[PDB]
Amino acid sequence: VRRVKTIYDCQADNDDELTFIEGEVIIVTGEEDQEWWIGHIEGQPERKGVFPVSFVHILSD
């Protein structure tokens, strides 16, 4: 439903967070914080976790 494209390269501190580098596409499946959402990489469903919206771009535009 909700899609985001990683516009930056961010790394997870814990197992909870999702490490993503610029160019990745994440399907947002949930939300934790305003600036921290939950999802998994489109072509990589094994990569799931919570990622900062600060480093990604909402693809509802």
Binding site: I7, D13, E17, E22, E32, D33, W36, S54, F55
Partner: peptide, 19 residues
Amino acid sequence: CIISAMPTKSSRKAKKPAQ
């Protein structure tokens, strides 16, 4: 294509640093 300059990890307020 990197957008702007790198932002700051705002620290996930939802999660607490389990010590």
